Amino acid sequence: GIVEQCCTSICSLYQLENYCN
């Protein structure tokens, strides 16, 4: 999930936008 991709590991804009509506 988002925590695994952005918190426990380094985040990226590509990944963040996956969570925008």
Partner 1 sequence: FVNQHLCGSHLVEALYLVCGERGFFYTPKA
Residue 18 Cβ vs partner 1, minimum distance, rounded to whole Å:
10
Site string for partner 1, 1-21 (x = CB under 8 A): xxx--xxxxxxxx--xx-xxx
d(CA 3, CA 1): 6
Amino acid present at 6: C
Residue 15 Cβ vs partner 1, minimum distance, rounded to whole Å:
9
d(CA 6, CA 15): 8
* 15: its two tokens: 């990944």
Residue 10 Cβ vs partner 1, minimum distance, rounded to whole Å:
6
By the criterion CB under 8 A, which residues form the site for partner 1?
A: 1-3, 6-13, 16-17, 19-21
